[model samples]
Target: MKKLREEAAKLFEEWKKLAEEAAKLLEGGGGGGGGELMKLCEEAAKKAEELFKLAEERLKKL
Candidate 1:
């Protein structure tokens, strides 16, 4: 559980950074170069999925 806690925290931090970066990219241009934004969105989704799986496992243990 302790290990899971630490790993979850790390994943959360990475997700936060990705969110911030996406926000910055949007702020720079309203609809310019959407491919970059799409990539970021995909990466964010992957991180979210990972976090969800970890939480589900933790809940099962509990």
Candidate 2:
């Protein structure tokens, strides 16, 4: 539905931003295990998971 798409798009935008930040951190010499980058990636992944769940819930209503 339109609502789901709208929500997903927003989430995707956030994910993209976080991914970009993570990439930047990685390129600037990591802190031994991608320290900061890894944390950003994890946060992005969590947002993505929530987005998917929200979309799925909306889809089930139709």
Candidate 3:
């Protein structure tokens, strides 16, 4: 469970960085690169959500 928490935290940080990158891309205006960054951001967000969900279930079992 402790390890899960650390992993969850790391995932959240990854999502946060991706979100920032996405915001920067949006601020700079839409472009080919922006689209890719947006996709990456979305993927990171999903990964974070999945990690958190797994952590929740694991903790519940403990």
Candidate 4:
């Protein structure tokens, strides 16, 4: 559980960065993920969610 928490925290930070980037795109004009860049961003978001779920479930153990 502790390990999960640590990993999740790291993921959360990374996700925060990606979210900020996504927000920047909206601010700039639109999401330009019509290519690999967008795909990568979406992937990062998904990874963040996955890690978050791990943290949530591991929380039960703690």
* Backbone clash count for every predicted candidate, in the order shown: 0, 0, 0, 1
Question: Model 3, stretches more than 4 Å misplaced?
Answer: 1-21, 31-34
- Per residue, candidate 2 scores C-alpha lDDT tens digits across 1-62 of 35766775686777667676676566565455546666666576676767777767666665
Stretch of 10 with least lDDT, candidate 2: 25-34
lDDT-wise, the better of 3 and 4 is 3
TM-score of each: 0.40, 0.40, 0.44, 0.43
Q: State the lDDT at 3 in candidate 1.
A: 75
Model 2: residues >4 Å from true position, as ranges? 1-21, 24-34
After superposition, candidate 4 runs with Cα above 4 Å error:
1-14, 17-33
Instruction: Please write out the lDDT profile of model 3 over residues 1-28, one tens digit for every residue.
Output: 3677667567667657758667556546
Q: Report the C-alpha lDDT of model 4 over 15-45, residue by residue, as the tens digit.
A: 5686757855644556554445555556766
| Model 4 residue 54 distance off true place after TM-score fit, in angstroms | 1.8
Give one digit per residue, the lDDT tens place, for model 1 in 1-62: 35766676577667667676676665565655555765566676577768777777665565
Question: Model 4 — which ten-residue stretch has the worst lDDT?
Answer: 26-35
lDDT (Cα, 0-100) at 19 in candidate 1: 75
TM-score, candidate number 4: 0.43
lDDT of 4: 0.64
Relative to the unseen true structure, what is the C-alpha lDDT of residue 39 in candidate 1, on a scale of 0 to 100?
59
